[PDB]
A paper describes a structure:
The KdpD histidine kinases (HK) of this system contain a universal stress protein (USP) domain which binds to the second messenger cyclic-di-adenosine monophosphate (c-di-AMP) for regulating transcriptional output from this two-component system in Firmicutes such as Staphylococcus aureus. The KdpD HKs of this TCS are prototypical among membrane-anchored HKs that contain an N-terminal sensory cytoplasmic region (NTR) in addition to a canonical transmembrane domain and a cytoplasmic C-terminal region.
Here, we resolved a 2.3 Å crystal structure of the S. aureus KdpD-USP domain (USPSa) complexed with c-di-AMP. A sheet of five β-strands (β1-β5) in the structure is sandwiched between two layers of α-helices, with each layer containing two α-helices (α1-α2 and α3-α4). The c-di-AMP binding region in the USPSa was found to involve β1, α1, the β1-α1 loop, β2, the β2-α2 loop, β4, and the β4-α4 loop. One of the two AMP moieties of the c-di-AMP in the USPSa:c-di-AMP structure occupies a pocket similar to the ATP-binding pocket in the USPFG subfamily of proteins, which we refer to as the “inner AMP” (see the Experimental procedures section). The other AMP moiety of c-di-AMP in the USPSa:c-di-AMP structure projects outward from the “ATP-binding pocket”, and we refer to it as the “outer AMP”. The c-di-AMP in the USPSa:c-di-AMP structure adopts a V-shaped conformation with a C6-C6 distance of 8.3 Å. Similar to USPATP proteins, the side chains of the first two β2 stretch residues in USPSa (Ile270 and Tyr271) are able to form hydrophobic contacts with the inner adenine ring of c-di-AMP, and the main chain carboxyl and amino groups of the third residue (Ile272) form hydrogen bonds with adenine N6 and N1, respectively. While the absence of a Walker A motif in the β4-α4 loop of USPSa could alone accomplish the ATP-binding loss, this loop was found to adopt a conformation that is structurally distinct from its conformation in standalone USPFG proteins. Interestingly, USPSa seems to utilize both the α1-binding mode and the α4-binding mode to interact with the inner and outer AMP moieties in c-di-AMP.
Numbering used by the authors: 236 to 276, 280 to 363
Write the structure that this text describes.
Amino acid sequence: KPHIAVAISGSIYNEAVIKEAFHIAQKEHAKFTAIYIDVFEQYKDSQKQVHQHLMLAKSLGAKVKVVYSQTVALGLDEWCKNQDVTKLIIGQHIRNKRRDFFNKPLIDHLMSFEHSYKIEIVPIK
Ligand SMILES: Nc1ncnc2c1ncn2[C@@H]1O[C@@H]2COP(=O)(O)O[C@H]3[C@@H](O)[C@H](n4cnc5c(N)ncnc54)O[C@@H]3COP(=O)(O)O[C@H]2[C@H]1O
């Protein structure tokens, strides 16, 4: 039942995460999905990057999905649980100035959510 999802964002780093996610799904003969959580609440004019990253993953054999949610973490966690993801592939958070609650690393919320799927963090090359 191997379902591997790559978590899409508009960061420049996400493209490398897509390619590594492709290698992991291939080397594991897994079903390959790309999930972007659209949240209105910033990163001015990254809608083109997302668009690009989603197409890249489509061109690598992934089914792409867009989910609208209040939060990145809620969207991803609910979506992974409903689609029976077995591993979610995400990029490395790098700390910046904003140390408020919704600028915490995505992984802190998934951990607090007691994620039931594996999570693979891909660092920057
Ligand atoms: N559009 C953007 N432009 C510039 N910088 C951005 C950005 N979106 C996020 N970043 C920041 O840089 C890090 C890049 O994480 P990456 O996208 O490679 O890997 C991301 C991504 O795989 C996933 N993810 C992040 N946002 C997502 C979203 N809206 N929907 C689905 N997956 C998301 O979480 C991983 C770690 O996210 P985290 O927020 O903790 O860390 C993110 C964030 O601190």
